[PDB]
Structures are given as C-alpha cells and as structure tokens.
C-alpha cells in the first residue's frame, strides 16, 4: 500500500482520490492519503472551496516513483511532484502516519469499482494522450481541449485522444461510401483496432480514460471522445464477441458510478438511444441496457 503525502493544505479544498472525496479546511493539519492500492492507475483531484471553477488533478501510478502534493501560492494550485530521495520520502511518510495526519484510501474489500473503471487504463498510454514527458504523472483539468476540438489552441496543454470522425476519408473507403457509413466495421476493425490501437485493450483503455476525465473534471472534449468510441462499436455490424461482452461490462460500471445529478450533462441522448435501440449492437449490451433503463429512463 502506497502513500501520497501533502506538505500542507493552506487553502480550503475538496480532495478527490479515485471515486472518493474529502473536505479539507484552510490550514487543516492534513498530510495526505495512505493505503493506496498498488496495481492500478489513480487520480488525485481538487476543487477549491473559493472557486468551484477549474476542477484539476493528477493521474499517477505509485509503482513509477514517490509522489507528493505541495500547494504553490504563486500558481495557486496543489501541484504533484516527485521526490527522488527515497530515504527523505520514507522518513516524511513515517512521521505523518505516526502522527495520524493522513486519510486512508477507503476501499471496501468486496468492492471492485475502481478496477472495473480502470481495467485497461495504463499510465504509459495516459502519458501519450497528455504530453509532459519530464513528469511521470499527468495533469488534466476541466478546460483542457482535445486535438480534435483544436482542428474545429495551445498544443502543449491539449488532450491527444485518437481522432474519430465518421465523415472523414479515414472512416470511408472510396467506392464503399454507403457501406462504410451505415456499417463502420472497416473503420473499427481495420483502421482503428489493427491500424492505430493495435488491440481492443488499448481501445478500451482510451475509452475508460475519456469517461473518467469527463466525470471527474467535467471535461467536455473527453465526454465527446467517450461517446464517439461507444458509437463506433455500436455502429459496426462486425465486432468480436469478446469485445461486445467486455464493452457491456465497461459501460455498466461507468453508468453505475455516474452521479445521478450529472446524467443531464455527461450522457448524450442521441448516442445512447441509437446504441441501445437502433444500432447493430442494440441487443448485445444487456447489462448496460438494464442499468440505463432503471437509472435514467428519462434520457431514453
């Protein structure tokens, strides 16, 4: 079990760690989060009590180094940093634990929610979507735009999601216009799976990462990416059976986890109605269709 110590909490802030969140008061003696499960990517996220504008946060994996948070009163945010001195870090963490100034990652033993939301998500893939190679962790916030959003403006601070465009030469083979537009199997299987992602795991990893950025930061471009990647599978007549079964599970845990109150801004009515009721795969997502119908019958 790993630890992300905090130098201090000089400003009042809501702190998220994965799907959990805690209120810290201005100058509360808070020195960080312990008992963080090894084996998964994690996100530590922030919303200042005084400006509920800009949710922001850090994707990290504790296997890739020793990370801490320290408030920067110049840039006005909690920054993730790497401690390269292993002894300094162990000594810091041990003091704060002994003094019990750390909240414990509050995992229920039975509860697989975070595994189920992050099954295919890998830190090395996150670092290619979020380019800042001098750090081993990745910063995301509410306002960051996608490469695709920028085509339709600072490239260094963009989300480099794979561009999906149903009305593009990439998506449509010359002389197969009607066929490729009404059945996207070619686009899914040859262009994206074989050509760009290499396997369904990398495809699902990007889909899951896009959902979590949508939910945790209300990143609009991430929401568009998550919907596009669902719609490309649902609009394909030919999908491997294992991908359909896995997509049903992925979407089930995402729908189960979404705050009930955010369904209106995070769920696209057109895409979901199409995917569950019109698409080739309308009968292939039993778990997802059942949770959607029982939790968000309004949307449909």
């Amino acid at each position: 079990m790993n630890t992300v110590p905090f130098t201090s909490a000089p400003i009042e802030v809501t702190i998220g760690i994965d799907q959990y969140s805690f209120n810290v008061k201005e100058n509360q003696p808070f020195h960080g989060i312990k008992d963080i499960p090894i084996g998964h990517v994690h996100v530590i996220h922030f919303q200042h009590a005084d400006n509920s504008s800009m949710r922001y946060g850090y994707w990290f994996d504790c296997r890739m180094g020793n990370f801490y948070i320290q408030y920067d009163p110049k840039d006005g945010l909690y920054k993730m940093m790497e401690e390269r001195d292993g002894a300094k870090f162990e000594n810091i963490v041990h003091n704060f634990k002994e003094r019990q100034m750390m909240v414990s990652y509050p995992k229920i033993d039975e509860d697989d929610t975070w595994y189920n939301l992050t099954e295919f998500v890998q830190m090395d893939k996150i670092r290619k979507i979020v380019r800042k190679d001098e750090n081993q962790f990745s910063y995301v916030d509410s306002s960051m735009t996608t490469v695709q959003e920028n085509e339709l403006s600072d490239p260094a601070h963009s989300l480099n999601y794979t561009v999906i465009n149903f009305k593009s030469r990439e998506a449509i083979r010359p002389g197969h216009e009607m066929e490729d537009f009404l059945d996207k199997s070619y686009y899914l299987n040859t262009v994206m799976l074989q050509g760009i992602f290499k396997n369904s795991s990398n495809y699902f990893g990007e889909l899951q990462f896009a959902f979590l950025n949508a939910m945790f930061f209300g990143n609009y471009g991430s929401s568009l990416q998550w919907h596009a990647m669902i719609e490309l599978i649902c609009s394909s007549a030919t999908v491997p059976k294992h991908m359909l079964d896995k997509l049903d599970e992925i979407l089930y845990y995402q729908i189960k986890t979404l705050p009930e109150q955010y369904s209106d801004i995070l769920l696209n009515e057109r895409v979901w109605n199409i995917c569950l009721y019109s698409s080739f795969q309308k009968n292939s997502l039993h778990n997802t269709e059942k949770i959607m119908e029982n939790k968000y019958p309004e949307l449909l």
Partner: protein, 237 residues
C-alpha cells in the same frame, strides 16, 4: 448553412451552384399480386440537377436495372443520387465545378457530404424553400426521355429555353417555379393552359412553348389563378 427567402438573390450570383432533387430517382407502381398481396414494380427515374443561374439541367436517367437484387431501395436511392452527383462533379473541368450544392431534401445531406469528401471546398446545403422540382416529370420531353431509356444515360437540357435572352435568371427561375408549382397542383389544368392555343408551338430544341413577352404575362396570370383556386378547394377557404 440553409437556403431560404432571406438569401434568395444568392442563387443568381456568379458562384457556380447546383440544386439536386432526388424525388424522382426511385419510382414505383403499387399493384395486387395473384395471391392478393401487394408488390411494387420500379419504373425509370431521374436525378434533377439544375444550375439556377444558367438553366443547365443535368438529367441523369436512373434505369430500373440499378435496383435489381438490391434491398432498402428508398435508402439506396439517396446514396445512388450522391454517387451520380459526385461522378458529375468529377467529370466537369475544375472551373465548372460548383462551389455549392443545395439538396431539396435534408435526407440527401449525409449521402452527398460522404460522396464529396474529396471536395472539402464544395459546400453541401439544405434549403427551407418548398421547391416543386418533383413536377419535372410533368414536362413531356423530360418524361419521354426517362421512360424510353433502356440503359443509364445523362441528357443535358436548358430548362429556361431561350428566356435568358430577354429576362434575368431571377425572373427565369420565378417563371420556372410557378410553372412547376402549377403542374404539381393540377397537372391537367396546367398543361391545358400551356397548349390551349395551337398557334404557339414548342421548338424541337425547347421544353416550353414559344410565348411572346405579352403571352407569358397572360400564361403566368392563368397559372397563379390555377394555384389559388386549387388552394381554396384543398382547404375550403
């Protein structure tokens, strides 16, 4: 975006544009089978592709053979229209290619946009105008070449005959739309109005009769009367 009463003059500027109407591409007769079920028999169709400035009509005849062994024909008809329009654009020299294509039905936007991905600078637009191009098959010479076709064929017409020698393209288009509206509302009455006086003929190289300026005003009057009558009939007002 969409083309309406507010941006009507744009049709007659010097940017090459075409209207595409797909309403006569897929045409059927519905009949009873021996077993008392219902079946369709396809008949020849056409794409109506019109430059509203010049009057040049690219009438692509759609022979029934194109439907043989195909499913979901009303959906295929949109994609076949888009394929033929894109083939027509590629066959024109660069300086004759349209800067815009306006489709008379919104169902044509995605099929045409997908077929024209090679032409990102050609704008594909809908219209809020209710254009009567469906009535094109009430023009005897266009109807005759469609029904006699034994294979796919493109036939070139000027739907304005020689009018542009005497009137602007704004006025030529208004005359055309009023003739087609009339033919669409009451074909028998409209055609009676156009051919009641046997002294006025249709030249071999024309679609409409050779009316003097004065006779057009009278014809145009009788067509407006036909439309309002039929309107007071339809709606009992």
């Amino acid at each position: 975006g969409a083309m309406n009463s507010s941006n009507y003059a744009e049709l007659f500027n010097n940017d090459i544009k075409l209207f595409v109407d797909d309403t006569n591409v897929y045409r059927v007769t519905v009949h009873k089978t021996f077993e008392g079920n219902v079946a369709t028999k396809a008949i020849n169709g056409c794409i109506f592709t019109l430059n509203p400035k010049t009057g040049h009509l690219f009438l692509k005849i759609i022979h029934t053979s194109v439907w043989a062994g195909q499913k979901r024909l009303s959906q295929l008809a949109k994609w076949k229209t888009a394929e033929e329009v894109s083939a027509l654009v590629r066959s024109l020299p660069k300086e004759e290619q349209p800067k815009q294509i306006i489709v008379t039905r919104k169902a044509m936007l995605d099929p045409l946009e997908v077929h024209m991905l090679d032409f990102p600078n050609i704008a594909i637009r809908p219209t809020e105008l209710r254009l009567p191009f469906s009535a094109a098959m009430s023009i005897d010479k266009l109807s005759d070449v469609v029904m006699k076709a034994t294979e796919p064929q493109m036939v070139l017409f000027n739907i304005y005959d020689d009018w542009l020698d005497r009137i602007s393209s704004y006025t030529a288009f208004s005359r055309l739309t009023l003739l087609l509206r009339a033919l669409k509302t009451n074909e028998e009455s409209a055609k009676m109005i156009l051919l009641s006086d046997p002294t006025i003929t249709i030249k071999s190289y024309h679609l409409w009769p050779s009316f003097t300026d004065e006779q057009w005003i009278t014809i145009e009057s009788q067509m407006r009367d036909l439309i309002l009558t039929e309107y007071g009939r339809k709606y009992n007002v």
